[PDB]
Structure formats: structure tokens, C-alpha cells
Design a protein around this nucleic acid. Structure first.
Ligand SMILES: Cc1cn([C@H]2C[C@H](O)[C@@H](COP(=O)(O)OP(=O)(O)NP(=O)(O)O)O2)c(=O)[nH]c1=O
Ligand code: NA
Length: 342
DNA sequence: CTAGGGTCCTAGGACCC
DNA sequence: GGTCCTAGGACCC
């Protein structure tokens, strides 16, 4: 009853694409991210930049202090999506059991594969080698009996490498595995787990499920399961997008409704264009807006609405502006749509 | 000195029986 | 007791 799961994961995806398409960027620190004047953050960075401490989600101002010579690139999302479509077509050569998680990564369920003598290790190697050919980007991979171990595994031999976890190896791997390494355990959850003396899966194994359920809800059942290598989530190839959003951080805050309305006027065609690619008649389940204020508090307001409509987004943003603002400056404006259920 | 694309979970009151 | 509506938050890429 044991499954073979591969998690395939592109190395420094956006940056690797920019380096292939401009070899001059190979050995200098580079990053995709908005400028400091735009109040941007790092999307990702190459290994020369990471050597200085540059990380995804880091404010560009902090990145540049760590790495004064950092080259900042705007990002070319159609180039990234083209690489994505190609690696996914490569995955299909081995199995239809493909669950994309993002542009640059996917789960593959190769249990019923008879490629490469049924070896998931060699299938993962072949996909990585085929990706390096054909695209001149490198990938890493993880091979495990369940999703989350495969995903942790793909990080352990990166870049351009892989790691395999057999069922016989699962207990020793789990024993000292930090909880923070479990997908879905973030900074807040790890800090809370740490505050009750839980750091590793070995720690959680010695815990009562009932306590975890009280203390954490359904997440605590996930914690109890993962700490034991239990992860029955199937590789699902039939997931569909449920929302589409378009939002903008300004280079400095706005304090007048006229400015907000102007922002909306430029955002709305972008929202309409992306919605129409997937829903030509613009028919939707809800639409709404987002403001992010001075104190970084965020409010959304969204309602049932049959079809993308600019004026109603303006009107509801005006309400949000007047009501839930309380005189602060505004750093971000966003528009949002919730897609119909089929 | 804090993006923009998203997913999933929670929870109170409305609404229904 | 269910289920829908809405707002917010943690989290991932
Ligand atoms: C974590 C992260 C990623 N991205 C974009 C840019 C990344 O290149 C792309 C894939 O995300 P990964 O977490 O896999 O990071 P990576 O750049 O590919 N480096 P890796 O080699 O460690 O996987 O997704 C962002 O825009 N913001 C992010 O916070
Ligand atoms: Na990656």
C-alpha cells in the first residue's frame, strides 16, 4: 500500500530564467523585486545574492543594505509561465498524476509508473536531466512515500540535486525534524509550538492528540499526523483557480479619495483582462476591494455580484475609504473577484 | 521597512427547519 | 443543528 511521490522544484526559478536569457547575470548578485523607491520586496534571488543574505519576501531596502551591488530585475512573467508549461509537459511524459503547486513545482504520483523499471529515483533523475536539456534550467527533486516528506526532501539536495526517503528511513528522519519544516507550520505556529516546548516531530509524537485538537483545532490533527509521517493527501490533478485579484502598492501613501479612485481606474482594465482569459462573459460569484492602511492593517469588503463591474467596485471602495479608514494614509489598493463554482 | 499572485481555515449572525 | 454570507488571518510561492 506504499505510494511513490515525487516533488519536483525549479532552482531559483525566476532568477534562473533571467540568467539563462542573459548570461551576463550568472556570477553577479541579482534579484527579481520592486525597487526601494517602489517600496518593493525580493521575489527571489540567485546564489551570488543569497550569499549576502538576500532572501525571498525581504524588503528591497534590506536586501540592498546586505548586498549594495544587487542587480534588481522587474520580472518577465510570460517567460516564467512558458518555462512552467514546458516542465509540466515534461511531467506528462511520465504520468498524468500531476498536481502543480505553482509555476515552478509539482507533485507527481509515480506509484503505477512502469517508467525506469518503476524506480522513482531514476524517474526523478530523468525529469531533472530532461528539464536541464530542452530548457537549460536546473531542478531539484524529492522522493518519499507521501506529499509533505517529498516536498521537504526536494530542499535537502538543492540546487540541481535530489533526495529519497524510504519508509524504513521515515522514523529517523522524523525524530529530529523541526516542526517549522512542515508545510503549513509558519512563524506564528512555530512560535506557539515552541512556547509549549514543542520543536520537532519527535516532540509532537509524545503528545496527546486530544490536547493538540483543543489547543489547535484541525491544524493540531495535521500536526499529530505529520509528526508520524502520516499524510494521506492524494495527488490531485483536477484543481482549479477560485479567485483573481489585482492590487497595487503606491510609492507613497494616499490621503485623498481622488487619488484612490485614480488607482482603481488603472487597476480595473487589468482585472477585466485577466478575468476574461478564463471567463469571457465576465460572469463571477463575488467582487470586492481591498485597502491596506498606514498601520499595515488590511480590510476587504466583497459581496455577491453577478458580473465584473467597475462602478460598483468604485462605490464599494468609496464606502470602505469613508468608513473603515479612520484618517490613516493608504499604501495599497486592490480589486478582487471570487469565481463561480464550476 | 515591509509585493502580488494565490489557498485554506475560522467564526458570528442570517436564514432555514 | 446545517448552511450561506462576510471578514480576517496564517500560510505558500
Ligand atoms: C517564496 C517566493 C517565491 N516567489 C516566486 C519567485 C520564485 O522564484 C518562485 C518559486 O518559489 P520558490 O519558493 O521555490 O523559491 P526559488 O526562487 O525557486 N528558490 P529554490 O531554489 O530554493 O526553490 O516563486 C515569490 O515571488 N515570492 C516568494 O515569497
Ligand atoms: Na523553486
Amino acid at each position: 500500500g506504499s505510494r511513490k511521490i515525487i516533488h519536483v522544484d525549479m532552482d531559483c526559478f525566476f532568477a534562473a530564467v533571467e540568467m539563462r536569457d542573459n548570461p551576463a547575470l550568472r556570477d553577479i548578485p541579482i534579484a527579481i523585486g520592486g525597487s526601494r523607491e517602489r517600496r518593493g520586496v525580493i521575489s527571489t534571488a540567485n546564489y551570488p545574492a543569497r550569499k549576502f543574505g538576500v532572501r525571498s519576501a525581504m524588503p528591497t531596502g534590506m536586501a540592498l543594505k546586505l548586498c549594495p551591488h544587487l542587480t534588481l530585475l522587474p520580472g518577465r512573467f510570460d517567460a516564467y509561465k512558458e518555462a512552467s508549461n514546458h516542465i509540466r509537459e515534461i511531467f506528462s511524459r511520465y504520468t498524468s498524476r500531476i498536481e502543480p503547486l505553482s509555476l515552478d513545482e509539482a507533485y507527481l504520483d509515480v506509484t503505477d509508473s512502469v517508467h525506469c523499471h518503476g524506480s522513482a529515483t531514476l524517474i526523478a533523475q530523468e525529469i531533472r536531466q530532461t528539464i536541464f536539456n530542452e530548457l537549460q534550467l536546473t531542478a531539484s527533486a524529492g522522493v518519499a512515500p507521501v506529499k509533505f516528506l517529498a516536498k521537504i526532501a526536494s530542499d535537502m539536495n538543492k540546487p540541481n540535486g535530489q533526495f529519497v526517503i524510504t519508509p524504513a528511513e521515515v522514523p529517523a528522519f522524523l525524530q529530529t525534524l523541526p516542526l517549522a519544516k512542515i508545510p503549513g507550520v509558519g512563524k506564528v505556529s512555530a512560535a506557539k509550538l515552541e512556547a509549549m516546548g514543542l520543536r520537532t516531530c519527535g516532540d509532537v509524537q509524545k503528545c496527546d492528540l486530544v490536547m493538540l485538537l483543543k489547543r489547535f483545532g484541525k491544524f493540531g490533527r495535521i500536526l499529530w499526523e505529520r509528526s508520524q509521517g502520516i499524510d494521506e493527501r492524494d495527488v490531485n490533478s483536477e484543481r482549479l483557480r477560485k479567485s483573481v485579484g489585482v492590487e497595487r502598492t503606491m510609492a507613497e501613501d494616499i490621503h485623498h479619495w481622488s487619488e484612490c479612485e485614480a488607482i482603481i481606474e488603472r487597476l480595473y482594465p487589468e482585472l477585466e483582462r485577466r478575468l476574461a482569459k478564463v471567463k469571457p462573459d465576465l460572469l463571477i460569484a463575488r467582487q470586492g476591494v481591498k485597502l491596506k492602511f498606514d498601520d499595515f492593517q488590511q480590510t476587504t469588503q466583497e459581496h455577491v455580484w453577478p458580473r465584473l463591474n467597475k462602478a460598483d467596485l468604485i462605490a464599494t471602495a468609496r464606502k470602505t475609504w469613508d468608513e473603515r479608514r479612520g484618517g490613516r494614509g493608504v499604501r495599497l489598493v486592490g480589486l478582487h473577484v471570487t469565481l463561480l463554482d464550476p
